[PDB]
């Protein structure tokens, strides 16, 4: 466990590519080639009222990263399913955990790969059991 | 359950239905979109399974002569039909519960995701739950339409040329319709062979490949020999026409000799090419 | 694949092996622990499937007379064997690929998760992937051990009383072992019945229920009637002993009359209870 994440703007990448960043594009969330655009920039805000963090796209305020009934992470004007606990495991590496309820299974952002290829993969909300799983480790780079 | 004719065999064609409603089927409603629809047995509701042995997963191809295949539109949660690009999002594990016969369609590109039908009859992919909205049933189209039925078979070459036992001979030929018992064929599925026989009404004997230089089909006594058994299937991409592959050699099919159409033209077994002379139109008597 | 004998039937008993190694099996290694282990065909390597029709999922019970079941230790990633308490983490969907016969064991409590074997032979639950480390093969233990084998059948009542055709009679009784053809039985699986016949070596005739007030078994010529076919299964919790259920009435089993052990004691077909007079020890000749 660790947090140590200030409020501000970040880019988000996976362990599979230095060149692919989490971007909101054609109404879809995925990892795309590095750009200077506002759609691959993320606003991190810690919220004390109910703990944990909210992520919003800077090209799209008013809506948060949330998970739906299909287990997809997506941009929502919410309900909310939007609160996240980034668990720090290295200098800028995090497991992004769902905050929900005790004694049940932990859930985290999961980015599937086919032999290190993540093209067109969505981020899914799936069970988490350790801090070792490459598909559940994200790098948050401060801007 | 009981019959094996609905098993998830390579190259067979199916209705794919939600487990909660036998009156709906997966339906291609446009050049890009699928939806649940009331069952009409139309070609845009028929889906050929093609297995990839390396993946242990299948492509699922609509049978309305468009060759489009069921596709997960990654990174969205929507599904479509689209042209076969041999990409991972176009392959599906079909994993079946033995007793219920219920099947999940689990996407090869991201196997956390399965096909799901919603109350609004749309199709989506989703992480997996205990809901029956992720279970589907598969029903073989041909077995449904033809099993235990008395049928007539036209060659695609000519609307008034039918598969006919010759008068006073065992040899099977093309002939104009005269409403003869020689021209009426009981189609019956054999569980052990997973293939069909066709019984001539005139003499109760079966459509059989007689193996010699002529390669004629004749009516023959009941046998366990593969020469008497036929994989009745649709054309590659088109569910309105049939190809009959002989189980003795499935590279060979029921074939009108040199595409001739005159009364008495020999019907034979020959190497598949799928040309007009190998295409059959089967209808209830 | 070809034989149906390994199908995921309710109440059948299996070796569960990783798809990458047929010489390893799921093994109860202690009072609580499970691991893959070299295949030895011990009872702690044998697993009964019991289907729940409401859930369309199974409990998976080890057969070393301990009654423990395969359990996902939620919320951790580990699995164990534990007492059956009817909780959802102890039910598994068994979903099978038709052609490969490969099976995933998907947990009922959380169907995001499947059983996975690691390279160190440990078992965990995991989110789903394209790896064969999530595919298992199921092999019916009794079919593997007994099919097409000449066997003797000892009543559990007495270490030297065996199923024996009488000299000069068709009636089958208990008798001391004489290494007689009358006491040697070829067990043969019938694909169509999905059940076994047992053929006496003395006369090539089959163990058959003769329905009258005596309800004896006799040797009888081949018939398609269910009276000649037997579901050979293990005792409820113990793979060291067998029960033989008659297909004509599967509530009735091969039974030593009044638990008597004298030479000549009648063997009959009677209502199942599972007491020692219905238990059989089957060995190869």
Swiss-Prot record, chain A:
CDD domains: beta-trefoil_Ricin_HA17
GO cellular component: a single term: extracellular region
Location(s) in or outside the cell: Secreted
Primary location group: secreted
Subunit organization: Botulinum toxins are produced as large progenitor toxins of 12S (M toxin, about 280 kDa) and 16S (L toxin, about 650 kDa). M toxin consists of a non-toxic, non-hemagglutinin component (NTNHA) and the neurotoxin (BoNT/D). L toxin consists of the M toxin and the 3 hemagglutinin (HA) subcomponents of 70, 33, and 17 kDa. The stoichiometry of the whole complex has been modeled as one BoNT/D, one NTNHA, three HA-70, six HA-33 and three HA-17. HA-33 and HA-17 crystallize as a heterotrimer with two HA-33 and one HA-17.
InterPro entries: HA-17_C_botulinum, Ricin_B-like_lectins
Record protein name field: Hemagglutinin component HA-17 type D
Described function: The hemagglutinin (HA) component of the progenitor toxin protects the structural integrity of the neurotoxin; may increase internalization of the neurotoxin into the bloodstream of the host. Involved in binding to the small intestine through interactions with glycolipids and glycoproteins containing sialic acid moieties. The hemagglutinin complex composed of HA-70, HA-33 and HA-17 agglutinates erythrocytes, whereas the individual compenents do not. Erythrocyte agglutination also occurs with the entire toxin complex.
More about this protein: This protein can also be encoded on a prophage.
Pfam families (UniProt xref): Botulinum_HA-17 (PF05588)
Alphabetized UniProt keyword annotations: Hemagglutinin, Secreted, Virulence
Swiss-Prot record, chains B, C:
Mapped 1-beta repeat ranges: 55-99
Molecular function terms from GO: carbohydrate binding
2-alpha repeats, residue ranges: 148-192
Sugar-binding site 2: annotated span: 255-278
Record flagged with keyword NADP: no
Domain of life: Viruses
2-gamma repeat start-end pairs: 239-285
Keywords noted in UniProt: Hemagglutinin, Lectin, Repeat, Secreted, Virulence
Entry-linked InterPro entries: Ricin_B-like_lectins, Ricin_B_lectin
1-gamma-type repeats, residues: 100-147
2-beta repeats: 193-238
Signal peptide as annotated in the record: none
Record's GO cellular component terms: extracellular region
SUPFAM superfamilies associated with the record: Ricin B-like lectins
Cellular localisation: Secreted
Record bears the keyword Repeat: yes
Domain Ricin B-type lectin stretches: 11-139, 179-283
1-alpha repeat windows: 1-54
UniProt-annotated stretches for the region Sugar-binding site 1: 166-182
Assembly information from the UniProt record: Botulinum toxins are produced as progenitor toxins of large molecular sizes of 12S (M toxin) and 16S (L toxin). M toxin consists of a non-toxic, non-hemagglutinin component (NTNHA) and the neurotoxin. L toxin consists of the M toxin and the 3 subcomponents of hemagglutinin (HA). HA is composed of subcomponents of 70, 33, and 17 kDa. The 70 kDa subcomponent undergoes proteolytic processing and is split into HA-55 (also called HA-53 and HA3b) and HA-22-23 (also called HA3a). The stoichiometry of the whole complex has been modeled as one BoNT/C, one NTNHA, three HA-70, six HA-33 and three HA-17.
Domain notes: Arranged in 2 beta-trefoil domains (called 1 and 2) each with three tandemly repeated subdomains (called alpha, beta and gamma) joined by a short alpha-helix. Only subdomains 2-alpha and 2-gamma, in the C-terminal beta-trefoil domain, possess a functional carbohydrate-binding site.
Role according to the record: Agglutinates human erythrocytes. The hemagglutinin (HA) component of the progenitor toxin protects the structural integrity of botulinum neurotoxin; may increase internalization of the neurotoxin into the bloodstream of the host. The hemagglutinin (HA) component is involved in binding to the upper small intestine through interactions with glycolipids and glycoproteins containing sialic acid moieties. Binds galactose or oligosaccharides with galactose at their non-reducing end.
Extra facts: This protein can also be encoded on a prophage.
The name this protein goes by in its record: Main hemagglutinin component type C
Record organism: Clostridium botulinum C phage
Gene name of the record: HA-33
